Amino acid sequence: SVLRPQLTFEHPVDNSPTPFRPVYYDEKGVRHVGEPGVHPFAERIKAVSVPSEQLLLKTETPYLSLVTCPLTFVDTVEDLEALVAVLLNETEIAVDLEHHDFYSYQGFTCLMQISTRTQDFIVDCLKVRANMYLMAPVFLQPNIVKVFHGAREDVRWLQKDFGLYIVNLFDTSIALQNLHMPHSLAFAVDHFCQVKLNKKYQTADWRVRPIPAEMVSYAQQDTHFLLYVYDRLKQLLLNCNMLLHVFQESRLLSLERYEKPHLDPDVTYKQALGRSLGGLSSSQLQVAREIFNWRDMAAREADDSPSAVMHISCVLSIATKLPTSANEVLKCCSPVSVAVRTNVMKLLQIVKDAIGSAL
């Protein structure tokens, strides 16, 4: 990879096999250091009720035209601050996040999309990453409903990257599940707005700056229709209290905590290699486990995902073939990565030690 935004981070990411410890800010902008296995706003979220006017049967406010709708790309602190001030006047906002996971161990949030009743925003989470805590007054606000579609990943990403926590989250995917119907975003936007979403950039590289026009359009359309979908879902839940239930299930989701990826040195390799372990000798299983565990350690050290360090087929290839020279380790898996070529002797020592260990 050309891009490596982690190098620009104000604080280096801790990929160590130790529990995640949150560093978060309150609505006053006061920094706090949290505790492992403790969500720092659990007592707040459990003590906060859904705004009563948000449980009333109301008429929908249509989404605007994409042609004349204001779109703002926010990538400075002042711009982020001005946006936060705009959001503190709303009773509901639509939020989405774009993420990167290949050239990062834990992964990091790349972009944040926000739509209000009258406009759209795209926030550069990479550029203003160190200042995202300024959004806490909005995300902690009990009178502001934060609408997300399929918030399981988002809730954790907000915590991992920014120390951001949602008070009065409403998940539109949970709403669709409770109505017993298809619950993807593309489905919701098509069923209520009669618009077909792009889907082309679902797997794009969100680290690219500048963001091309088509990607800006994709990012904007992910939240632009969401408050209308929210209005439509409220009406459906109020007649056939089910609306209240969805708010209660959404609150339970906002109570989830981010947990760093865990390497179980005796389990994870089995889960990733599965039935491919069949037909391997005791020594080949030892090399399979040991190299997979090396791969994870190297990924944590280089701040890359295990797949960026070495393809899984390459782990199986070394386990099967048992290479006994540096060149044989290199030749085992044709597209030789940078991490593998530099630690070729350590991978070779794993093989040599496993065939040495038994016979």
Numbering used by the authors: 176 to 415, 423 to 541
Reproduce text from the manuscript describing this model.
The exosome is a 3′–5′ exoribonuclease complex that plays a central role in numerous pathways related to RNA processing and degradation, both in the nucleus and in the cytoplasm. The eleventh exosome subunit, RRP6, is a member of the DEDD superfamily (DEDD-Y subgroup) of divalent metal dependent exonucleases. The EXO domain consists of a classical α/β fold composed by a six-stranded β-sheet flanked by α-helices and the HRDC domain is constituted of six α-helices.
The TbRRP6CAT construct crystallized in a sea urchin-like form composed of very thin needles. TbRRP6CAT crystal structure was refined at 2.4 Å resolution to final Rfactor/Rfree of 16%/22%, respectively. The polypeptide chain was clearly defined by the electron density, except the residues 416 to 423 that could not be modeled. The T. brucei RRP6 structure shows a closer match to the human RRP6, both proteins presenting a shorter linker and a more accessible active site. TbRRP6CAT is the first RRP6 described up to now that was crystallized with the native catalytic site DEDD-Y comprised by the residues D271, E273, D329, D397 and Y393. In the TbRRP6CAT crystal structure, these residues exhibit a configuration similar to the mutated active sites of the human and the yeast structures, even in the absence of metal ions or nucleotides. The apo TbRRP6CAT catalytic site shows only moderate movements of the side chains comparing with Mn/AMP bound Rrp6 structure, and a water molecule that is coordinated by Y393 and E273 residues could represent the hydrolytic water.
